[PDB]
Design a protein around this ligand. Structure first.
Ligand SMILES: O=C1CC[C@H](N2C(=O)c3cccc(NCc4ccc(CN5CC(N6CCOCC6)C5)cc4F)c3C2=O)C(=O)N1
Ligand SMILES: [Zn+2]
Ligand SMILES: [Zn+2]
Lengths: 379, 26
């Protein structure tokens, strides 16, 4: 089906009281922001997080947070648990509603990462929620590499014409070569060639990543993937399956160009996926992962008991056993059901099988694999 | 009869559930 339904989380609720999001701090700051417990994942800025909180204390914290500035900390827990965190992301709330249900206090929340911080101290409060003294990392952008030695005479020959049509044979290599030769004409003053300066270019890395991502979807260049280097880098980082340590490493990166180069390197050096209790599995084909969502291959989704199963959508997978009828109670994708897919050796839960219901769609397949137990076994 | 959590499975005997819930931990 379309790609705009798996981004509003209609399984959670329909009548969400939304808010216009304007809440930003200014670089160097010492601000105390609340930390929601029982959440353990790395949140890239710009990524949506759906929360369904049941415990009375967390509900009260969210109720107080809505009235004040709607922001809370999502600490990027390292390999060590028990508050052993050093970095994290601030999440702004824009969706919120309560449902008495079988009378407890249920609150459903949707929030997106906004800024990046490093923690200084983690003062705990006797109420059950812990605050966090955090310093906010600035979003620094470096100037153009040619601007340092750009010739004064050669400044008008820098505004290139827009992209003609899109993704046509001989419409990329022919134009990109001319762009490289014209923009980096001052490279001959220095002792480095033009292609080396093209390696550290802003738009060039964007287009290489776009070319290597077009194997996943058909999104138009003029939209979808944002033109902003920062937004593009974060969006690309939030939609790739590798281990947490590399998410923390990518989050630590300060400049957009360094992050873009790191994303290209990892994207070239990743080949397979594997179970995280076993030796091998068949999902090894990383080429067959398709984005049936506007948010990319992956997004964050919440089950009926609050647990946030981040899910990777794949078209084929083996070494999994399917148990149960195709139930569709709390389906994340409205048209399909789920049938809980286990592992074939270690008997560990890995994703679901989204069987279909109608004719003119994918009658089967579309497996959604959870990130928790996928080990990117790149040889 | 039985239901599970975090994953959604179902088994027939209580002893089987005790095995399942431990596999989730490790
Ligand atoms: O695509 C998918 C697949 C993955 C996912 N997934 C699970 O991981 C799961 C676990 C258990 C049951 C189950 N099946 C649907 C279902 C839906 C609702 C309820 C009722 N609950 C009790 C009520 N709350 C009570 C207070 O606090 C507790 C909650 C809410 C049970 C139930 F079962 C699911 C379920 O579908 C999902 O959501 N989507
Ligand atoms: Zn396994
Ligand atoms: Zn289970």
């Amino acid at each position: 089906f379309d790609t705009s339904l798996p981004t509003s989380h209609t399984y959670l609720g329909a009548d969400m009281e939304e808010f216009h999001g304007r809440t930003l701090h200014d670089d160097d700051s010492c601000q105390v922001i609340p930390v929601l417990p029982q959440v353990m994942m790395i949140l890239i800025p710009g990524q949506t997080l759906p929360l369904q909180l049941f415990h009375p204390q967390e509900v009260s914290m969210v109720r107080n947070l809505i009235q004040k500035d709607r922001t809370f900390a999502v600490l990027a827990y390292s390999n060590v648990q028990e508050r052993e965190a050093q970095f994290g992301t601030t999440a702004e709330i824009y969706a919120y509603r309560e449902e008495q249900d079988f009378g407890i206090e249920i609150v459903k929340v949707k929030a997106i990462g906004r800024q990046r911080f490093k923690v200084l101290e983690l003062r705990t409060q006797s109420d059950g929620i812990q605050q966090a003294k955090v310093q906010i990392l600035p979003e620094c952008v470096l100037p153009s590499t040619m601007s340092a030695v750009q010739l004064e005479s050669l400044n008008k020959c820098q505004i290139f014409p827009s992209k003609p049509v899109s993704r046509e044979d001989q419409c990329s290599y022919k134009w990109w070569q001319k762009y490289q030769k014209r923009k980096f004409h001052c490279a001959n003053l220095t002792s480095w060639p033009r292609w080396l300066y093209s390696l550290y270019d802003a738009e060039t890395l964007m287009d290489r990543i776009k070319k290597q991502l077009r194997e996943w979807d058909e999104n138009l260049k003029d939209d979808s993937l944002p033109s902003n280097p920062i937004d593009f880098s974060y969006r690309v980082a939030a939609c790739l399956p590798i281990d947490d340590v590399l998410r923390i490493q990518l989050l630590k990166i300060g400049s957009a160009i360094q992050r873009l180069r790191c994303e290209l390197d990892i994207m070239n050096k990743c080949t397979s996926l594997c179970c995280k209790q076993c030796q091998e599995t068949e999902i090894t084909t990383k080429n067959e992962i398709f984005s049936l969502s506007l948010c990319g291959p992956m997004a964050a989704y919440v089950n009926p008991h609050g647990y946030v199963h981040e899910t990777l959508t794949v078209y084929k997978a083996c070494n999994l056993n399917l148990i149960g009828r195709p139930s569709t109670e709390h389906s994340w994708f409205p048209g399909y059901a789920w049938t809980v897919a286990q592992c074939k050796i270690c008997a560990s839960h890995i994703g679901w099988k989204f069987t279909a219901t109608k004719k003119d769609m994918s009658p089967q397949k579309f497996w959604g694999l959870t990130r928790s137990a996928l080990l990117p076994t790149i040889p | 009869p039985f239901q599970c959590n975090q994953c959604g499975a179902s088994f027939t005997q209580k002893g089987n559930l005790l095995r399942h819930i431990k596999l989730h931990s490790g």
